[PDB]
Design a protein around this ligand. Structure first.
Ligand SMILES: [Mg+2]
Lengths: 105, 206, 151, 98, 101, 127
RNA sequence: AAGAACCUUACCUGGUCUUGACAUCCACGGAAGUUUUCAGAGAUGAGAAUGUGCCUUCGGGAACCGUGAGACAGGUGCUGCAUGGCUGUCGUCAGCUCGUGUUGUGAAAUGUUGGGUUAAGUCCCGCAACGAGCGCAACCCUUAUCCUUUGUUGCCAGCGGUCCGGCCGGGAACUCAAAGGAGACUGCCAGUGAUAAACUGGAGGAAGGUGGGGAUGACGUCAAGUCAUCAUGGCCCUUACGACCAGGGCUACACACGUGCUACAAUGGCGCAUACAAAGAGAAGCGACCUCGCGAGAGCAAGCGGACCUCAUAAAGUGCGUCGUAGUCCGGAUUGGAGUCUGCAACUCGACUCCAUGAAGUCGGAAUCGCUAGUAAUCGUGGAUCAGAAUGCCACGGUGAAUAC
């Protein structure tokens, strides 16, 4: 952003821009984590099977929202609801955000 | 035996020449023979003193030998006796008064010839080839280097068949020409035969 | 080739009156890379044919060529089993070149006095369709029209 | 007058050798002509990389010899001896002719 | 590499530079188209056998100086092709790098 | 007054000085008809002179060395095209849509080791 | 093997030498060295004249040479199936792997597969994979266009006079020349494509998509080739398998094969007049000029350890005259005399020019190789090897195609 971005080559500058965009939209949210997470709020258990399969391999609660076609086996606290409709997910997720943020009291 | 010499391929790009002198086609061969003779004699004499390379220049019909080593104290002796001893026993054959000059390096674990000498000296003490190779590579990498690759070949372990074993650590690009790569081979004559040990030390990329 | 879909090269036009077809004809006359001599022979035969038939250098060639210009050629395209011939229409860029090649091949033989005289006689003969290049054309047309069952 | 012809192997050494030998003679012995190119002599060699059969495998080496003329015009006192006993920056065969 | 042959060759060199290159007039100046057409030149060629079968410059094979190899020799460096390649790749010969053009 | 083109093609090197006057060509103290005008490729120098006529505009004092007949002639052609600069791209836009500006290096390849003439292998045989 | 007359030579016959030809130690006697005669194939033996310093521990020393024993030397003798190093090949083919994680009891798998694109696991996208290394590409050299310093033994457009030879004044514009930079990097536009990678086409540009060429050779395979270039484990000879020399052979020929040259002719052979190159070598060598011969070469003898001097006249090509499709003027093999050049010596066993001779051969069976561009085809030039000795090797340059459905 401030140092070396127009030094070597314009093609390589575009290369680095593409690399940064890819790395950020892939692993940009968990950037400032710094350690291991404590809870994994997941939106699906049938589609994102491997996420829970990995989170259950160690002592991390993986309570999540599951629909009818998923396996409520490895999840800690199953939440029955919809996973695709935006309205449904946003209601659940707004409740989640309010409960976590007032928990910062 | 299918690769090119990493030093010969970079003699003009990065790595310089060992002998830097100009002579015309009449005495070129005589000069090269004198250089070879002084080099082999100096090595046979200072084998126990760690010399990696010997630069042989000749300013104005006066030979100058810059000995790059790691232990200059054993080379010069107290009061410097051995240096003038070498000067005499070198000028006896060079034909002119020789000006020899020692130069030490405080990182002997990064020189190809020095590492090969260590491996050969450790092998000639019945040391395990695996232990020696691993210890040398670990020492080099903890002393500082962007990449190393050692290769031993022969009757290691006293076997009847010969197997070549190489161990690498880091980045060692031999096809990149701008890279600074030290390479040199050492022979080791044991009670069972000859063992060759070559080393690629990727000191830096430029 | 297999992947390269490159096309043909752009040859140099003729140093005489502008013409690419007789330039290609000259290019296919040359042995040992001697182009000056080939151009001299081509010009000699062209003048000898124009003065003898009444037409000019560019028109005379055209009449002769079309008499040796083949229609279809047979080539082996085996399809899962038997190996048979397949008569097919040849592209024009290869058709004219092959006509000129047959002309030069017929002229290589039949040595009258010189190469220029050979080629002028061969062109005159193809003009009335009784030479050897036309005989080769008819041999190709006979190889075709007989094995036309494979299509 | 003074024909100075210097030849060496490495150009990125001979060039600065010429620069120093020219400024150490023009700052006090000016009216010099500079580093004339004097094209390079390329001695090539083609050897066999194997000690035995497989002749088709050969190595190709060459040595370049770069030459330069300085061509000083006037035999000055700031020049004749200031050229002598100053033979550092070795690796370059220098020849002075009167 | 047949130290016998190497000593033989150095002996040849010594004896040749000792006898010839100093008395070559017996075959270079006397064998001339001049008044020496008489028995003088006959006695000259007669004494031309005074010197041993050696001593001639044509019996100098010019072997390598490190190994003593008769084939693959280069008069420029005085070494065979094997050793000249080895030295060139090690960096012993000045200016001699891999050629590419 | 007098303009210049360099020109070079296949080991050739030319110097074409171009001046307004007669339509003659004086090349190496020899005229164009007696230099190479009697051999083939007689108008490889006159090719880029019909799109812009030469008969009664200007003449050329030409020198050329290196290469052969056709090489030197192509070098002369390229030198003429480069010397046509007092009549700059205003005419080169037309001179280029027919060639006459492509350097066309395509130098002879070096003979390769083990080969015969840089492409002809030495007659492989199985047994 | 980048070059067998002797030499090289490692083989054979014959004559010899023996701690030995090559290297170190002890003791003894002699300066070393130089000229020369006898016998011999020579190795060698027997001799004859000369020479006596470098510093004085000065019972001699620092070298050299003559001899005796012992440690030893030497071996191109075997073992590449004991090895190092080096090399070829699959193959500049694009693949070979590792760390962590995950699946599987496990051997293992994933990564590295799949949709596209590329010369390329090149790139993009998807995907329990996330990354990395050796590879690819780039970095290196050369060529291709241009810019800057110098302008010579280089050049000379604009000028002075010319035996018009840039020969001489005169210049750093131009060619060439050795350095440092610019540029060519999918840079921009249109379409297609999953708005990605990328492909196609176009504008500028000398050059479009890795511009042309080269070096650069991945883990490994062939238990591949070399212990005859060299180093070395062990087996052996070590009064010999070691060592010196004269001659011979490696060049032998009932035959078979591979690699090239010469041709088989008229886009051509012969005689004459003509024009256009690059790259290189050179001092116990290249060797101007002049004289002699049809000639290879010889005699005198400048310049050059070199952008000046030499090698060194470039040929194909262009014009003229001849040859009329004949085994012919194509072809040049073999043969006898004589001569030139290197070398101590050219029979075995060199090259070269001339005199006479002229063969087979009239485009080649099955089968088989190279090449997609300045490449092929064709023509000539230089260099390493070398006293001399290539049609081979390496490199340079001239003309310069066809086809790729
Ligand atoms: Mg794979």
């Amino acid at each position: 952003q401030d140092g070396t971005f127009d030094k070597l080559t314009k093609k390589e500058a575009l290369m680095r821009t593409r690399e940064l965009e890819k790395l950020e939209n892939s692993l940009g949210g968990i950037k400032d984590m710094g350690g291991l997470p404590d809870a994994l709020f997941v939106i699906d258990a049938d589609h994102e099977h491997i996420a829970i399969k990995e989170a259950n391999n160690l002592g991390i609660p993986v309570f999540a929202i599951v629909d009818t076609n998923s396996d409520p086996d490895g999840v800690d606290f199953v939440i029955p609801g919809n996973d695709d409709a935006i309205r449904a997910v946003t209601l659940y997720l707004g409740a989640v955000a309010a409960t976590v943020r007032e928990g910062r009291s | 035996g299918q690769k090119v010499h990493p030093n010969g391929i970079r003699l003009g790009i990065v790595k310089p020449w060992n002998s830097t002198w100009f002579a015309n086609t009449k005495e070129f061969a005589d000069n090269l023979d004198s250089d070879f003779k002084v080099r082999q004699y100096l090595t046979k004499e200072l084998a126990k003193a760690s010399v990696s390379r010997i630069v042989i220049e000749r300013p104005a019909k006066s030979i100058r030998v810059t000995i790059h080593t790691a232990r200059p104290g054993i080379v010069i002796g107290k009061k410097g006796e051995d240096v003038e001893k070498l000067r005499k026993v070198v000028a006896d054959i060079a034909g002119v008064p020789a000006q020899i000059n020692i130069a030490e390096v405080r990182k002997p674990e990064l020189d190809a010839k020095l590492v090969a000498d260590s491996i050969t000296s450790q092998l000639e003490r019945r040391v395990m080839f695996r232990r020696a190779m691993k210890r040398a590579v670990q020492n080099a990498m903890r002393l500082g280097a962007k990449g190393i690759k050692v290769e031993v070949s022969g009757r290691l372990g006293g076997a009847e068949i010969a197997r070549t074993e190489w161990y690498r650590e880091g980045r060692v690009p031999l096809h990149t020409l701008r890279a600074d790569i030290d390479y040199n081979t050492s022979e080791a004559h044991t009670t069972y035969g000859v063992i060759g040990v070559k080393v690629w030390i990727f000191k830096g990329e430029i | 080739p297999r992947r390269r879909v490159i096309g043909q090269r752009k040859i140099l036009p003729d140093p005489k009156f502008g013409s690419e077809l007789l330039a290609k004809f000259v290019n296919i006359l040359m042995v040992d890379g001697k182009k000056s001599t080939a151009e001299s022979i081509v010009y000699s035969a062209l003048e000898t044919l124009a003065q003898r038939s009444g037409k000019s250098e560019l028109e005379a060639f055209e009449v002769a060529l079309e008499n040796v210009r083949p229609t279809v050629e047979v080539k082996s395209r085996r399809v899962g089993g038997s190996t048979y011939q397949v008569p097919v229409e040849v592209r024009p860029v290869r058709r004219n070149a092959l006509a000129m090649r047959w002309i030069v091949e017929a002229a290589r033989k039949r040595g009258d006095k010189s190469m220029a005289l050979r080629l002028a006689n061969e062109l005159s003969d193809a003009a009335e369709n009784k030479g050897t290049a036309v005989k080769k054309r008819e041999d190709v047309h006979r190889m075709a029209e007989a094995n036309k069952a494979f299509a | 007058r003074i024909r100075i012809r210097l030849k060496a192997f490495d150009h990125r050494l001979i060039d600065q050798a010429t620069a120093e030998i020219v400024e150490t003679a023009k700052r006090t012995g000016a009216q010099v002509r500079g580093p004339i190119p004097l094209p390079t002599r390329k001695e090539r060699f083609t050897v066999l990389i194997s000690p035995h059969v497989n002749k088709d495998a050969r190595d190709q080496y060459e040595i370049r010899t770069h030459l330069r003329l300085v061509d000083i015009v006037e035999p000055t006192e700031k020049t004749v001896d200031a050229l002598m006993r100053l033979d550092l920056a070795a690796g370059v065969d220098v020849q002075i002719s009167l | 590499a047949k130290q016998s042959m190497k000593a033989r060759e150095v002996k040849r060199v010594a004896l040749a530079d000792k006898y010839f290159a100093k008395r070559a007039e017996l075959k270079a100046i006397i064998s001339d188209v001049n008044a020496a057409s008489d028995e003088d030149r006959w006695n000259a060629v007669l004494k031309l056998q005074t010197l041993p079968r050696d001593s001639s410059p044509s019996r100098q094979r010019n072997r390598c100086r490190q190994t003593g190899r008769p084939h693959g020799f280069l008069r420029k460096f005085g070494l065979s092709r094997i050793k000249v390649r080895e030295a060139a790749m090690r960096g012993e010969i000045p200016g001699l790098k891999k050629a590419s053009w | 007054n007098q303009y210049y083109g360099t020109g070079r093609r296949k080991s050739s090197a030319a110097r074409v000085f171009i001046k307004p006057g007669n339509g003659k060509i004086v090349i190496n103290q020899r005229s164009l008809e007696q230099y190479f005008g009697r051999e083939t490729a007689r108008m490889v120098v006159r090719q880029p002179l019909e799109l812009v006529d030469m008969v009664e505009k200007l003449d050329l004092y030409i020198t050329v060395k290196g290469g052969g007949i056709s090489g030197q002639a192509g070098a002369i052609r390229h030198g003429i095209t480069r010397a046509l600069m007092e009549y700059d791209e205003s005419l080169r836009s037309e001179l280029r849509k027919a060639g006459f500006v492509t350097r066309d290096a395509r130098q002879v390849e070096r003979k390769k080791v083990g080969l015969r003439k840089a492409r002809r292998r030495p007659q492989f045989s199985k047994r």
